Design a protein around this nucleic acid. Sequence first.
RNA 1: AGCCAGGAUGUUGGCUUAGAAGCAGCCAUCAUUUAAAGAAAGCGUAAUAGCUCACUGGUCGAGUCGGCCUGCGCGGAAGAU
RNA 2: GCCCGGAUAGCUCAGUCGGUAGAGCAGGGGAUUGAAAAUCCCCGUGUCCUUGGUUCGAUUCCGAGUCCGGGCACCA
Lengths: 141, 38, 586
Amino acid sequence: AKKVQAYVKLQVAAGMANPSPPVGPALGQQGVNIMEFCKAFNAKTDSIEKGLPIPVVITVYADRSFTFVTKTPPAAVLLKKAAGIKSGSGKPNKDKVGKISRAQLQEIAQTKAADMTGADIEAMTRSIEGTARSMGLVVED
Amino acid sequence: MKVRASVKKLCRNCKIVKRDGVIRVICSAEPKHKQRQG
Amino acid sequence: RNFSIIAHIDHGKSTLSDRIIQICAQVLDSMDLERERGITIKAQSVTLDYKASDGETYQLNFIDTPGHVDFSYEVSRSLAACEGALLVVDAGQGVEAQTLANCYTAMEMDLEVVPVLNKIDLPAADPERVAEEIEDIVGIDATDAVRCSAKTGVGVQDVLERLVRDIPPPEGDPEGPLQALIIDSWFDNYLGVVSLIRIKNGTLRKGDKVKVMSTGQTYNADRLGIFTPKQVDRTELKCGEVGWLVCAIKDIHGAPVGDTLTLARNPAEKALPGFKKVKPQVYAGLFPVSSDDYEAFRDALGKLSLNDASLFYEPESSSALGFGFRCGFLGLLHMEIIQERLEREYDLDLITTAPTVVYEVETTSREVIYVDSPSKLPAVNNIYELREPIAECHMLLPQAYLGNVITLCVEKRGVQTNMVYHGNQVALTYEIPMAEVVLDFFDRLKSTSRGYASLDYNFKRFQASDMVRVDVLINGERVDALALITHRDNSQNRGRELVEKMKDLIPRQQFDIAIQAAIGTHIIARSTVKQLRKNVLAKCYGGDISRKKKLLQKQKEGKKRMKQIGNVELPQEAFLAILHVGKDNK
RNA sequence: AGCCAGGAUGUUGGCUUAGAAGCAGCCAUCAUUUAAAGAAAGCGUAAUAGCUCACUGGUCGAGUCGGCCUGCGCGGAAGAU
RNA sequence: GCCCGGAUAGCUCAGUCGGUAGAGCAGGGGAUUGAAAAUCCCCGUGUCCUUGGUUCGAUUCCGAGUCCGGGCACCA
Ligand SMILES: Nc1nc2c(ncn2[C@@H]2O[C@H](COP(=O)(O)OP(=O)(O)NP(=O)(O)O)[C@@H](O)[C@H]2O)c(=O)[nH]1
Ligand SMILES: [Mg+2]
């Protein structure tokens, strides 16, 4: 499972299963029934909030069979949403753009506690600041 | 190979050697970096 | 029996032919253009009475074929005329790019193939290696295809034996309505239009009333017969056999190729399915060197084109050459040649030039007009939205070369509309400006992809851009002849380059000169010719300086006058090199 | 110094670009897993993947390192009977 | 290549210590004529040569560039 015969990590929109500029060609362009995947990845989608990126490393086999294994939505995106911005720093990063509550961030680790191996949950949020600080915005934490 | 008077290294792979009286840079990495005389 | 030989450029493919003729390079070839270069160029249908090992006398409607990217449409046709397809391959040179391309056309045609290891005499040859290299590629069986030389040979079997047992008999019923297919029809003076043809139904006796279909024309059957290695008449062509059909065709376009023909005694519905469509890859425009020539040169294509469909041309105009034609060549050899088939025949001297392309335009008003040439644009204040034509593309290449091809299209201004897929062989798509395409874009695909490529074009949709004129000044004398249209970022290079041709071919003048490409009044580039000047000082040598500034002061004060009267005749320069034709044959 | 290993997570950092995934550019460069690992020192890719150095373990068992001030030398250094 | 001054509407040009830019002409309209010139009147229709930076703010200031004029040096 964890070891792949030829895996393909790839960020992908929640709202689609068969685009092309995003994915299809992207899959290593190597043996994938896109007709399957479109019934595949979109099936998960109803549970998830739509229009947004989701990491989902894929696991190809010489069998041509595979088990795509969706993770959880990226931390870097969820900050911007509460921030309400449609993009990044826009202005150079050293100067601020966004804003965040101290209660914000704190559940962000809980949203992604799986990927986040951080022991203390409060400690886990320290990492979240990097997601925040690269945006350069001043969290009200 | 460039002659030049001030040889010195370029690539990290560059070597510097003193065959005869002459000095010589030697980068097995990039061929362009060969140099005599310095 | 029929078939038609197919292979990679230079592989005995025309060598094996006459050798086959000998059984019953040199020969087949006729024009001196073939004897030189040695490349095959016009396929020569042939026929012979082969004696089968089993005592049968199979008849062989043999057809040699050209092998080049530029001759693809000569090849696509001849396959139509025959069920068969011998596929010669080198023991050494391995599979071609074209040797693959010729097959994939054959695949959709569902035609039979009979692979053969030519040049097996080769010391370096690895004939055991070769058959392996088709199974994983051509997809055709070659597990045990017959080997043979071509030098002589061997002389094995010759493979006509294996050929006939793999070649279906022609399928069509005599007594039914006539359905000859036209093929490479080729005009002649005295005989009128000649028409090579592939009889499909019924048969064709002399003096009978044939009827061209789409034209609706009907004609007498004055002469006919299969073509041996030399000419031979016959009282009638049997069903399923090739041969010329001389008739009082007279007309330039009385029997266009691929139209069905039928006896007027009994018209059908009907078929046969028609050729074919083709598109230009290279796409340069030709101009007669002298305007007086244009008449005969206008009709030189009225005769040459019929001998060569792979051509496309329409009337076009230039600032410095009058009417000319915007040619649509299949490739650089196609252009190379026809470059000689005209001059070396009609003696119509010519000048190639980089292709013109049309531009839709909307004035400051609210209407459209198309701009064939740079000189005729509305004054820039008058313009509202100049718009670049775009061209659709359909490259079909293996993934190993994909990193090379995308890199090319992006420089050309591309937008990867699609990228999927077909197994292994990727199926890319792009929308690219035609101006960046018609100029040798086809070539780099045949270079970067190592010959494994494909293309398709069309007029598509116009698009606005930051594109602008780039006038060429000469001492402030703007020259309409050298006007250009380019995307602005491109302009600085086309800008600082166009002057560089001028600098090397404007003769030194008695006053200092100022070539300078510029947009509007703004000047994006400059070069200058140098003054000529008398030595003046060559005399004084007492060494006092004030006695020497007096002379040099006149040299300066007077050039200031000669500079203002100026004026510069510019004869044929507004032409050569400046219009590409700086290389031979020119 | 050499030889055997690891070289990870947040995460494609932010934008900007069709693409910007350690690496086309601009601002930033914290945080967790720890023996240890830069949001990256090169190679690499169309874009990813891919390969290394940096830092750590292992064997290894004797000095290693980079500057300073001075003596003398080496390249720089081609001409006409 | 140096020195000095420049690059502002379709064309010829005025201006800037760092404070939301103009003139004649061309073009497009109005008035006048039975309408036509002519004449008077009215609208700028620009990213201040292009590209990055500093400033609350840049047409000015700074960096890099492509250019124009004049003055030296090169220029049978
Ligand atoms: N020594 C040797 N030469 C051979 C052999 N087979 C072919 N050739 C040579 O290789 C060349 C190829 O012959 P040719 O018939 O022109 O091949 P082609 O593919 O028909 N040429 P084209 O594609 O231009 O028509 C000729 O010079 C021919 O003499 C062979 O077995 N041995
Ligand atoms: Mg040949």
